[PDB]
Amino acid sequence: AKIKACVEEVTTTLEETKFLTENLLLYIDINGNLHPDSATLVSDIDITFLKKDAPYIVGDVVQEGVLTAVVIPTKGTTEMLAKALRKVPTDNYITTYPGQGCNGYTVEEAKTVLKKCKSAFYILPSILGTVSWNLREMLAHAEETRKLMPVCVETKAIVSTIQRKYKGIKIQEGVVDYGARFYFYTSKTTVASLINTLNDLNETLVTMPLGYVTHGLNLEEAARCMRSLKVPATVSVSSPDAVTAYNGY
């Protein structure tokens, strides 16, 4: 039937919005990996088809059952994002604003792009001071506040400091609650998977910018990714100048 073109923000959870349509529009990267905003919308659905045909080019669309996914770019520009969204078949969709988080686009840029399409879009809904604390200060803060502290296991200087401060700790990937509460991860897992994990734990964090250095990101790229966190976080950067730069991004 003819589609009633619109962009409408709802305040309902995914399940509570399905009365409008069963169709979900997801965002993926060139490898078929789901954007953190899309990753929580595929519960109890086989998503083998997303990575099955990787690698993809921006604008590629993959579909199966109630799911539609489009490969979006990283702000290259708004033109590229518009062009990608135009490839989605016209229909009624529950979705999120495209290009958020690591992709670097703003909510205003996403609204502009969706309003140029002919689909009916139903948009699902959705801080602590920035500091320059050294590792010893961060560990002391995590210990007294019980905030979760993400730690990259490949950063040997950090692992050796934790082993020496918390004698007897058994460091392994995942949550380790010994002296302080840590989330140990490898750089061999994506920043997106890490953000999804921290969002699911739903704990307040004390953290360095995620992806910065460990995943080859610069501070601006890490700041963009950090927008995908749905938990409160005390972010600690390298120096007082990096505080201005980070809060500037």
CA distance 120 to 68: 14
Amino acid at 40: T
Question: What domains lie within the chain, and their CATH numbers?
Answer: 6-123 (3.40.220.30), 135-248 (3.40.220.20)
CB 178 within 8 A of CB 188: no
129 token code pair: 């001071």
CB 47 within 8 A of CB 35: no
**Dihedral, CA of residue 91, residue 97, residue 101 and residue 103, to nearest 10:** 60
**Dihedral, CA of residue 147, residue 184, residue 101 and residue 232, to nearest 10:** 0
The candidate with the shortest Cα–Cα distance to 182, out of 197, 190, 192, 191, is 197
Please count the other Cβ atoms lying within 10 Å of the Cβ belonging to residue 178. 13
Amino acid at 226: M
CB 180 within 8 A of CB 139: yes
Please count the other Cβ atoms lying within 10 Å of the Cβ belonging to residue 69. 25
Q: In degrees rounded to 5, what are phi and psi of residue 46?
A: -70, 120
Give buried/exposed letters for 210-246 (b at 16+ CB in 10 A, else e). Answer: bbbebbebebebbbbbbbbbebebbbbbbeeebbebb
Please provide the size of the chain in residues.
Answer: 249
Sequence-ordered list of residues with C-beta below 8 angstroms from that of 122, at least 6 positions apart, any chain:
8, 10, 17, 20, 21, 92, 93, 94, 95
Experimental method for this entry? X-ray
Sequence-ordered list of residues with C-beta below 8 angstroms from that of 35, at least 6 positions apart, any chain:
26, 27, 28, 29, 72, 96, 100, 101, 102, 103, 192, 228
Resolution in A: 1.6
Q: What is the 3-state secondary structure (H, E, C) of the chain?
A: CCCCCEEEECCCCHHHHCCCCCCEEEEECCCCCECHHHHCCCCCCCCHHHHHCCCCCCCCEEEECCEEEEECCCCCCHHHHHHHHCCCCCCEEEECCCCCHHHCCCHHHHHHHHHCCCCEEEECCCCCCCECCCHHHHHHHHHHHCCEEEEECCCHHHHHHHHHHCCCCCCCCEEEEECEEEEEECCCCCHHHHHHHHHHHCCCEEECCCCECCCCECHHHHHHHHCCCCCCEEEECCCHHHHHHHHHC
Cross-strand bridge partners of residue 182 = 149, 176
After which residues does the chain become discontinuous at a C–N distance over 2.5 Å?
Answer: 75, 126
Q: What are the CA-CA distances from residue 70 to residues 45, 84, 138, 174, 206 (Å)?
A: 17, 7, 39, 31, 33
Bond into 55 cis (ω within 30):
yes
